[PDB]
Design a protein around this ligand. Structure first.
Ligand SMILES: [Fe+3]
Length: 308
């Protein structure tokens, strides 16, 4: 039996854990919480942690743990299974990307059409969108968006964007809350990840949603796709089963289990999401290097400088 610290959405972890149990008869116990609270906890517990695996929304979250030598190496063969365009690889082979989540602009299509959308994510952080664009400054992918802007456009551009959001944007606590604000008609548009929308559309039926997705494309920083992944803890006693689980998550069956439950992009070439996602290739996502521990701190610094 294994214990998985879970910084992913509960629906995601439950789905993959259930599938793994059916497949192997190995029981999975989830410890769910905020990604950075769990990351902090794993560092504190160190070699005494009861965690066998850490599953989370953003591979960026693994950076500190890897530097602290807390993660166990994964088979290179497993890593190669999910290595697609734009996917980051762990330099120490001690974590693995598993699913893609695209940055998107969700908008109220009863109020706006694609003709009203911006060609660049930079264009939303302006007086034109004063009180009309939702953003989530505490979101993991939001932080990744900031890193990508810094890397792609430089710090001045990234800083002015953030200042533009502080002045013109409507702050929401979570992506889920932002999406609902658009559906409820409290804001015409918001910057979130793609899966929230497809999952809502499955529940309620697209015809009953006001919101639709806009993809900026053309390798714009707002076309960023970031990745969720998993790592095995070096401290794990259950190494056999922990590695088996992470392996499983990269397998055709483990990937199929995730995409059935959650509208994230599979990273295996032989798996098709039942959600009818905008084809990865049509996204025209830019490629960005992996977020280092230092990249992370730097982006947090810009957020603070901007007054967020
Ligand atoms: Fe999320």
């Amino acid at each position: 039996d294994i214990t998985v610290y879970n910084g992913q959405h509960k629906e995601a972890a439950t789905a993959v854990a259930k599938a793994f149990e059916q497949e192997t008869g190995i029981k999975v116990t989830l410890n769910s919480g905020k990604s950075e609270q769990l990351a902090g906890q794993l560092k504190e517990e160190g070699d005494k942690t009861p965690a066998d695996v850490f599953y989370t929304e953003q591979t960026a979250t693994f950076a500190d743990l890897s530097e602290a030598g807390l993660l166990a190496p994964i088979s290179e063969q497993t890593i190669q299974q999910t290595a697609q365009k734009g996917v980051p690889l762990a330099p120490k082979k001690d974590w693995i990307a598993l699913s893609g989540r695209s940055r998107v602009v969700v908008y109220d299509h009863t109020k706006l059409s694609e003709k009203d959308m911006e060609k660049s994510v930079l264009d939303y952080a302006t007086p034109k969108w004063k009180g009309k664009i939702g953003y989530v400054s505490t979101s993991g992918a939001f932080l990744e968006q900031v890193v990508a802007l810094s890397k792609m456009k430089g710090d001045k551009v990234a800083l002015n964007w953030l200042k533009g959001l502080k002045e013109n944007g409507k702050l929401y606590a979570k992506n889920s809350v932002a999406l609902q604000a658009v559906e409820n008609g409290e804001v015409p548009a918001a910057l979130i990840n793609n899966y929230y929308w497809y999952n809502l559309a499955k529940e309620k039926g697209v015809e009953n949603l006001k919101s639709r997705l806009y993809f900026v494309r053309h390798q714009d920083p707002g076309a960023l796709v970031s990745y969720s992944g998993a790592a095995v803890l070096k401290a794990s006693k259950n190494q056999a089963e922990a590695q088996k689980f992470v392996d499983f998550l990269a397998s055709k069956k483990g990937q199929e289990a995730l995409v059935a439950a959650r509208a994230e992009y599979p990273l295996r070439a032989d798996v098709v999401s039942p959600f009818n996602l905008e084809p990865y290739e049509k996204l025209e996502a830019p490629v960005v290097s992996a977020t280092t521990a230092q990249d992370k701190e730097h982006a947090i610094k810009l957020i603070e400088e901007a007054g967020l």
